[PDB]
Write a structure and sequence with these properties.
This protein has four helices and four strands. 46% of the residues lie in helices and 21% in strands. The PDB classes it as de novo protein.
């Protein structure tokens, strides 16, 4: 199973602490810069949509809604969460990683 993380924030350190968790878990994290970027990664995720799960961390409620709107229309499974503090995002990446995509989480690191 493929596991991707999309981060939307203006704080460069929040991006680092988010990456730190992803790197420890060996998850594929992408930095979202615009509505086009968010869309762009989703259009790419349409490739391996067979076995993919995406986690999205947004700074604002607008970013939250816009992300899920693009995903719904293109039938992509994304987990939209809102965070202003790095520790919050660190939790979401933690829980999203520990499950290993599915209950039968087998040894996998990308």
């Amino acid at each position: 199973m493929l596991l991707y993380v999309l981060i939307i924030s203006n704080d460069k350190k929040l991006i680092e602490e988010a990456r730190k968790m992803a790197e420890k878990a060996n998850l594929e994290l992408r930095t979202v810069k615009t509505e086009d970027e968010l869309k762009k990664y989703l259009e790419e995720f349409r490739k391996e949509s067979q076995n993919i799960k995406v986690l999205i961390l947004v700074s604002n409620d607008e970013e939250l809604d816009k992300a899920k709107e693009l995903a719904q229309k293109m039938e992509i499974d994304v987990r939209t969460r809102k965070v202003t503090s790095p520790d919050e995002a660190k939790r979401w990446i933690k829980e999203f990683s520990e499950e290993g995509g599915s209950l039968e989480h087998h040894h996998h690191h990308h």
